[PDB]
UniProtKB/Swiss-Prot annotation, chain A:
One of its GO terms (molecular function) is metalloendopeptidase activity. Keywords: Cell adhesion, Cell membrane, Cell projection, Cleavage on pair of basic residues, Disease variant, Disulfide bond, EGF-like domain, Epilepsy, Glycoprotein, Membrane, Phosphoprotein, Receptor, Signal, Transmembrane, Transmembrane helix. This is Disintegrin and metalloproteinase domain-containing protein 22. It comes from the Eukaryota. The chain holds residues 233 to 718 of 906 of the full protein. It is found in: Cell membrane; Cell projection, Axon. It is linked to Developmental and epileptic encephalopathy 61: A form of epileptic encephalopathy, a heterogeneous group of severe early-onset epilepsies characterized by refractory seizures, neurodevelopmental impairment, and poor prognosis. Development is normal prior to seizure onset, after which cognitive and motor delays become apparent. DEE61 is an autosomal recessive condition characterized by onset of seizures in infancy. It comes from Homo sapiens.
Swiss-Prot record, chain B:
It comes from Homo sapiens. Residues 1-32 form the LRRNT domain. Changing N237Q: Affects glycosylation. Loss of protein secretion. Oligomer. Interacts with KCNA1 within a complex containing KCNA1, KCNA4 and KCNAB1. Part of a complex containing ADAM22, DLG4/PSD95 and CACNG2/Stargazin. Can bind to ADAM11 and ADAM23. InterPro entries: Cys-rich_flank_reg_C (IPR000483), EAR (IPR009039), EPTP (IPR005492), Leu-rich_rpt (IPR001611), Leu-rich_rpt_typical-subtyp (IPR003591), LGI_related (IPR051295), LRR_dom_sf (IPR032675). The lineage of its organism: Eukaryota, Metazoa, Chordata, Craniata, Vertebrata. GO terms for biological process: axon guidance; nervous system development; neuron projection development; neurotransmitter receptor localization to postsynaptic specialization membrane; positive regulation of cell growth; positive regulation of synaptic transmission. EAR repeats lie at residues 185-227, 231-273, 277-324, 326-375, 379-422, 424-466, 470-512. This is Leucine-rich glioma-inactivated protein 1. Residues 133-183 form the LRRCT domain.
């Protein structure tokens, strides 16, 4: 089960010059401080989300500020991710900025929703504060990256509730009294994010801390051949094997999904099944006790039939977008709604705005335009509604269909209710900039192949790392070579 | 007719090594003496049946105590010499009963003390000799200084042998200076079952009431002085979940109460003239005010205002003017800051001789900031931060004579008091505190204290020294977690309330003691 595994967030923190100055013009003080923040946030996540946060790297600039900082946290987020993309080569699951400057915002920080494992979307920005306060800020930023949202129809309606009356909850507004705990609805939102295929990169357990090793901390570090969570909790798994952070002769592995009673499980045994059409199931290698690094299908593969195309292991469709924005009770409208509404060029449907004007949709762009759903509530699940709701009644041969939509705002330039980029408008077609384009225009990468015009020679699935996972009876990087017996 | 233990001529008797005082003397005996007798103590009401003695002397004896009225029955006694003995303490009324005593010598017995007004009741005294005693000089010897100055009788000089600070100093040469016999203390009158956060008091119809905010169960507690055989009793409650600060306000003989909470915290009440029931009037918008950590009440120029501290960055500080019907928004301060505390203080800003109202609010990561009131625009214009201190949780204020000083609170660091000059605040005293959520100045009957609490170690109370012009360590109070200190004045009664966040709150009684009596 994807929920029961204990996941790992590889984290890189970047301290700007103002933070470096804020402690003693000092590298050791900034390092220890940031490490403490990550320590407290990790204490929150360990208990609450069943996820550990490990910092594999840190970079602080003593020389000068690299880019132009803004009082707006969103602008600072965009520019910081520009710096990570154009400069930082370090491998990590997320990269977050610790800024000594004070933003003017309602929010103490900003992070891209569901942007984990992404290069461009993969991190956030957190302003300066005290140790615990900045720990909370990092907690909610990483919460955004991991798929957790503060607001919802369940929460606005009172179905979802923070049960601490004295102190808030992490996703809520932070006062002087700092929240120690997530609402259960945030937990279930995380589980929903994982069950949709997102956050595959989080299943790798770092074997190297940047800090000197310690025994009994829950991680295997240089000088120790085994470790468990605590010597007290070691009795559940690893007790028969690990002693004083060292294995006796008969124990191959301490603990893990591939470890049963101090012995490697055979290669090919399946530790984790695929959670959706975009996910590839993984098998134990017979080398390591931990299940192999999580892999999913390469971008461009079809999911939910021809109705979607995989991105980051997650299936992007229009119906899933309606259910995501407006809640689970919502269903996607029939194509007649979009087809009728794109031609009129009214407020009720359109392909976009240039300046204060509606563009008439092209005939093939019908499905790339204003997003239409049928049963819509009064309030959006996330963000806030701009303008009012849109309801258009369409009658075909006596059938009445109510086509409803709305403009939902997260960031000024990002508007829900427009078809998301990468959503297919048809066979071998996808929506970009509210226009229907062929797949070849996206310049997708590919794996190695022997037979031309095929992916992994048709015998395998191409991963997001551009490595072939072969089907039965096939071996090799191109999956060309056959097996001894059919 | 003379005892065998004594050597007695016709008019004289000399007794050595006597176990007990004989009550039978010859009629013609005038003077009587006791040398090295085996007496334990003087007999109580002794020396009766022998009125004829004009003289009594004791030398080289051992006496633990000399009982009251020991010399009664000696109307003709004139000279009395008790000297060259070892005596610890004698009773005050011992010498009472002789109005005929002229010469009295206590000298050389090494008395370290005398009781107040030991010499009262003899108006006939002429010579008295205290010499040759080691006298520890304190309030008893203060009354002795009074008597030395006020007596017509000639008294040879005596000296302080203690405390070592005063040695070989004339007891005749001492003045009221460098004697404080008037000391103050705080002893807890009452313990309360509930944990507390904020406390404030108000006066209605000569009855005094106190408002306590209990954060966890969300109870805003109103208690009154019971006045029959009870220190304190709580006559009412107001139930609000996550209650933080309860500040009462009375405008034109009408009681209003503001409560603040985390959710739907903004509220304002009123108490109905009949049935003594509080009724909610207004609810301020939840959107603008979120997670207030403080409330302060101030009135400026015939207008009541109201102020709240917003600890969240989303909400802004808000001052509320009051028209006839209710409170409504006036001004907003410190956008996008986390505000821990707010304080209102009226100070003299030069060149002006008038007192200008000011506001001091403290942030989490930011230095405190001061606002100057502007009468023309009905706003606060000047915005200035007090330099060279950071992480100030709260700032309070007090005034000693014409000067105005402030106490700035720091959780871990140096909490310091500063003097207000013409322009800015000037450093006075740096007092380290560990885990202090409050620094409270308090003025009780021309005594300015300061209370600095600790969630870790003992709460350190300080007292003001007028000559030193600097707070001095005074008393230690034990509180599990103190978030406040409040001064409560009943009629001719003074109490202080100490909240406890992690434990039961304390009620201390203020007692003034005089050691000179
Ligand atoms: C696992 O280890 C074995 C030897 O212990 C090696 O042959 C095999 O290539 C390893 N698997 C990898 C590197 O994926
Ligand atoms: C239109 O939308 C409303 C939203 O509540 C829904 O109840 C209704 O069934 C829809 N269709 C109509 C009114 O034909
Ligand atoms: C194809 O690759 C080029 C080379 O880097 C790149 O610039 C371009 O954005 C890619 N996509 C296209 C041409 O659609
Ligand atoms: C003498 O001493 C007595 C003591 O009570 C005092 O009342 C009186 O005024 C004195 N007379 C003087 C100082 O002349
Ligand atoms: C107010 O609340 C306290 C705390 O539970 C309680 O002891 C007291 O009886 C209450 N006063 C009432 C109900 O009048
Ligand atoms: C502002 O601060 C200055 C000191 O720099 C002071 O002179 C003035 O009275 C204050 N009030 C203002 C400027 O309104
Ligand atoms: Ca990873
Ligand atoms: Ca270890
Ligand atoms: Ca997988
Ligand atoms: Ca205050």
């Amino acid at each position: 089960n994807v929920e029961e595994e204990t996941k790992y967030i590889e984290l890189m923190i970047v301290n700007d010059h103002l933070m470096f100055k804020k402690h003693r013009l000092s590298v050791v003080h900034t390092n220890t401080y940031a490490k403490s923040v990550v320590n407290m946030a990790d204490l929150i996540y360990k208990d609450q989300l069943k996820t550990r946060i490990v910092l594999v790297a840190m970079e602080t600039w003593a020389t000068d500020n690299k880019f132009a900082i803004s009082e707006n946290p969103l602008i600072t987020l965009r520019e910081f991710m520009k710096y990570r993309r154009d400069f930082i080569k370090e491998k990590s699951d997320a990269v977050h900025l610790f800024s000594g400057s004070q933003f003017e915002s309602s929010r103490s920080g900003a992070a891209y929703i569901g942007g984990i494992c992404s290069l461009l979307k993969g991190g956030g920005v957190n302003e300066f504060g005290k140790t615990d306060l900045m720990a909370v800020t990092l907690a909610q930023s990483l919460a955004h990256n991991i798929g957790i949202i503060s607001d919802k129809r369940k929460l606005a309606s009172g179905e979802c509730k923070c049960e601490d009356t004295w102190s808030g909850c992490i996703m809520g507004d932070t006062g002087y009294y700092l929240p120690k705990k997530f609402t259960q609805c945030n937990i279930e939102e995380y589980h929903d994010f994982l069950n949709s295929g997102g956050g595959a990169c989080l299943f790798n357990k770092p074997s190297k801390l940047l800090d000197p090793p310690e025994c009994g901390n829950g991680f295997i570090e240089t000088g120790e051949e085994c470790d468990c969570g605590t010597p007290a909790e070691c009795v559940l798994e690893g007790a028969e094997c690990c002693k004083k952070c060292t294995l006796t002769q008969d124990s191959q592995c301490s603990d893990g999904l591939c470890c049963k009673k101090c012995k490697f499980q055979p290669m090919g045994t399946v530790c984790r099944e695929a959670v959706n059409d975009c996910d590839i199931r993984e098998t134990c290698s017979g080398n390591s006790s931990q299940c192999a690094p999580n892999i999913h299908k390469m971008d461009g593969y079809s999911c939910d039939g021809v109705q979607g195309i995989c991105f980051g292991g997650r299936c992007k469709t229009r119906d899933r977008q309606c259910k995501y924005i407006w809640g689970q009770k919502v269903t996607a409208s029939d194509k007649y709604c979009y087809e009728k509404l794109n031609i009129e060029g009214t407020e009720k449907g359109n392909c976009g705005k240039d300046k204060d004007t509606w563009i008439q949709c092209n005939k093939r762009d019908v499905l790339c335009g204003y997003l239409l759903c049928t049963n819509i509530g009064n309030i959006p699940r996330l963000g806030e509604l701009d303008g009012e709701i849109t309801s258009t009644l369409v009658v075909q041969q006596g059938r009445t269909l109510n086509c409803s939509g709305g403009h939902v705002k997260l960031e000024e330039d990002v508007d829900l209710g427009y078809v998301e980029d990468g959503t297919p408008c048809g066979p071998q077609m996808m929506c970009l900039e509210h226009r229907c384009l062929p797949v070849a225009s996206f310049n997708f990468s590919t794996c190695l192949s022997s037979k031309e015009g095929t992916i992994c020679s048709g015998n395998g699935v191409c991963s997001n790392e551009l490595k072939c996972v072969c089907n039965r009876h096939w071996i090799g990087s191109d999956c060309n070579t056959y097996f001894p017996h059919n | 007719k003379c005892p065998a233990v004594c050597t007695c001529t016709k008019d004289n008797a000399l007794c050595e090594n006597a176990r007990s005082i004989p009550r039978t003397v010859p009629p013609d005996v005038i003077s009587l003496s006791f040398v090295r007798s085996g007496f334990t103590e003087i007999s109580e009401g002794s020396f009766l049946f022998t009125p004829s003695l004009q003289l009594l002397l004791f030398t080289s004896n051992s006496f633990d105590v000399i009982s009251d009225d020991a010399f009664i029955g000696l109307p003709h006694l004139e000279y009395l010499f008790i000297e060259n003995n070892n005596i610890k303490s004698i009773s005050r009324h011992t010498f009472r009963g002789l109005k005929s005593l002229i010469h009295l010598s206590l000298a050389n017995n090494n008395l370290q003390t005398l009781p107040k007004d030991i010499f009262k009741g003899l108006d006939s005294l002429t010579n008295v000799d205290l010499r040759g005693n080691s006298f520890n000089c304190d309030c008893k010897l203060k009354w002795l200084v009074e008597w030395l100055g006020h007596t017509n009788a000639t008294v040879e000089d005596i000296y302080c042998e203690g405390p070592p600070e005063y040695k070989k100093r004339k007891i005749n040469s001492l003045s009221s200076k460098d004697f404080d016999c008037i000391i103050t203390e705080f002893a807890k009158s009452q313990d309360l079952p509930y944990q507390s956060l904020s406390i404030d008091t108000f006066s209605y119809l000569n009855d005094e009431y106190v408002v306590i905010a209990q954060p966890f169960t969300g109870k805003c507690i109103f208690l009154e002085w019971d006045h029959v055989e009870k220190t304190f009793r709580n006559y009412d409650n107001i139930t609000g979940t996550s209650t933080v600060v309860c500040k009462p306000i009375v405008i034109e003989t009408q009681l209003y109460v503001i409560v603040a909470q985390l959710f739907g915290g903004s509220h304002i009440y009123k108490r109905d003239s009949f049935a003594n029931k509080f009724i909610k009037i207004q609810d301020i918008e939840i959107l603008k005010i979120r997670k207030p950590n403080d409330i302060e009440t101030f009135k400026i120029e015939n207008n009541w205002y109201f102020v709240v501290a917003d600890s969240s960055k989303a909400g802004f500080t808000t001052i509320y003017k009051w028209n006839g019907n209710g409170f409504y928004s006036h001004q907003s301060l410190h956008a996008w800051y986390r505000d821990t505390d707010v304080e209102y203080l009226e100070i003299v800003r030069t060149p002006q001789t008038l007192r200008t109202p000011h506001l001091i609010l403290s942030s989490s990561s930011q230095r405190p900031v001061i606002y100057q009131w502007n009468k023309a625009t009905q706003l606060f214009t000047n915005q200035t931060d007090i330099p060279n201190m950071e992480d100030v949780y709260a700032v309070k204020h007090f005034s000693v004579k014409g000067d105005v000083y402030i106490c700035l609170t720091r959780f871990i660091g140096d909490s310091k008091v500063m003097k207000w000059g013409g322009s800015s605040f000037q450093d006075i005293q740096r007092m380290p505190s560990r885990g202090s959520m409050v620094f409270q100045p308090l003025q009780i009957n021309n005594y300015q204290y300061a209370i600095l609490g600790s969630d870790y170690s003992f709460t350190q109370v300080y007292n003001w020294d007028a000559e030193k012009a600097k707070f001095v360590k005074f008393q230690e109070l034990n509180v599990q977690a103190p978030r406040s200190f409040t001064h409560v004045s009943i009629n001719k009664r003074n109490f202080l309330f100490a909240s406890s966040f992690k434990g039961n709150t304390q009620i201390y009684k203020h007692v003034i003691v005089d050691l000179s009596a």
